[PDB]
Amino acid sequence: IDLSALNPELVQAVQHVVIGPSSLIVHFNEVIGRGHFGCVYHGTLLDNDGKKIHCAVKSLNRIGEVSQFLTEGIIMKDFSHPNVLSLLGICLSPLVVLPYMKHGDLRNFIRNETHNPTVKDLIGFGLQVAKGMKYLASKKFVHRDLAARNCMLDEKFTVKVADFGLARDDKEYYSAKLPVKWMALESLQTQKFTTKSDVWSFGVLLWELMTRGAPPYPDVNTFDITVYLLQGRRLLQPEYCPDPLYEVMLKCWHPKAEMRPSFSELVSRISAIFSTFI
Numbered sequence: 001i002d003l004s005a006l007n008p009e010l011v012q013a014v015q016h017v018v019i020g021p022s023s024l025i026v027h028f029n030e031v032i033g034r035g036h037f038g039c040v041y042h043g044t045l046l047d048n049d050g051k052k053i054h055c056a057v058k059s060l061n062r063i064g065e066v067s068q069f070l071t072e073g074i075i076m077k078d079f080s081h082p083n084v085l086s087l088l089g090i091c092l093s094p095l096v097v098l099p100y101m102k103h104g105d106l107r108n109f110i111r112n113e114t115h116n117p118t119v120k121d122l123i124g125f126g127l128q129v130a131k132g133m134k135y136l137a138s139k140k141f142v143h144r145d146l147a148a149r150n151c152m153l154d155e156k157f158t159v160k161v162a163d164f165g166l167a168r169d170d171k172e173y174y175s176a177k178l179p180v181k182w183m184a185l186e187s188l189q190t191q192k193f194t195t196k197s198d199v200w201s202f203g204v205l206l207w208e209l210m211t212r213g214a215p216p217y218p219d220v221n222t223f224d225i226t227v228y229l230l231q232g233r234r235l236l237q238p239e240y241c242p243d244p245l246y247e248v249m250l251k252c253w254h255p256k257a258e259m260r261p262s263f264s265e266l267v268s269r270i271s272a273i274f275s276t277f278i
């Protein structure tokens with residue numbers, strides 16, 4: 001890369017979170033995942049006393065695409081919440097270094113046939129997500145792509161709200177590239193986004209949790225979802241979804257953004273629902 005050909009604002013930021021190349025071992029045959037524009041590798045981060053930290057290392061495959069890449073990392077830099085993915089740092093492709101998430105993404109986790117998360121566990125993951133979003137919303141950050149495929153799960157089954165960004169593999173869900181079936185009605189009609197539109201996404205995420213990762217509206221084509229919603233139609237109540245959790249989802253999908261619950265309300269109500277389970 002030619003550092004000169006990027007905004008000095010992005011440049012000094014990336015220097016506050018820099019990781020010297022000699023502190024980071026990237027294992028290049030050890031590919032976690034590779035999409036069209038980016039890839040992710042296993043990595044080892046050494047600290048100044050020699051202790052090894054297993055990490056994921058995100059990379060570009062390939063000025064514009066480099067400036068976007070670096071910006072995606074920099075956005076994350078000050079998120080510090082246990083339900084939001086954090087940045088370990090950036091190494092000058094430039095390398096964005098993330099903590100390793102043993103269980104990968106939440107959608108793949110809940111679809112895995114060899115494990116049985118209970119209805120309680122699934123509601124539990126939804127609650128963790130609500131807590132990460134309450135934090136993001138407190139910082140006035142709008143996610144715009146909240147979905148189970150963008151939430152990670154660590155060795156302690158802690159959910160980390162994240163966004164694969166350029167490293168998206170799973171791309172059929174986008175059609176601007178737009179995750180239309182997680183989108184609020186007014187984002188679909190205006191291509192504009194808010195915290196209340198993340199709330200709409202959140203309700204769809206909860207439906208993913210309760211169906212163990214079923215695809216939403218599978219008999220609806222990308223572009224047709226707008227008129228479907230305007231006809232007064234919504235996602236059906238999953239078989240094991242408690243009535244009050246389905247009522248939560250419906251409130252998330254209210255046509256008036258301002259009538260959707262806040263993430264603070266979601267946290268309190270879903271905590272109550274979750275506590276009712278043996």
Ligand SMILES: COc1cc2c(Oc3ccc(NC(=O)C4(C(=O)Nc5ccc(F)cc5)CC4)cc3F)ccnc2cc1OCCCN1CCOCC1
Pocket residue numbers: 032033040055056057058072073075076079084085096098099100101102103104105108136143152161162163164165166167
């Ligand atoms: C595909 O599998 C994996 C991907 C991983 C990973 O990927 C990323 C996730 C997010 C970002 N974020 C980003 O690049 C950014 C982002 O996150 N920003 C952001 C946005 C909003 C927000 F609220 C917080 C952060 C774009 C910068 C970057 C990544 F590289 C990071 C850490 N560990 C991972 C482990 C994985 O599998 C382990 C194998 C698990 N198995 C399961 C069972 O079968 C065996 C395999």
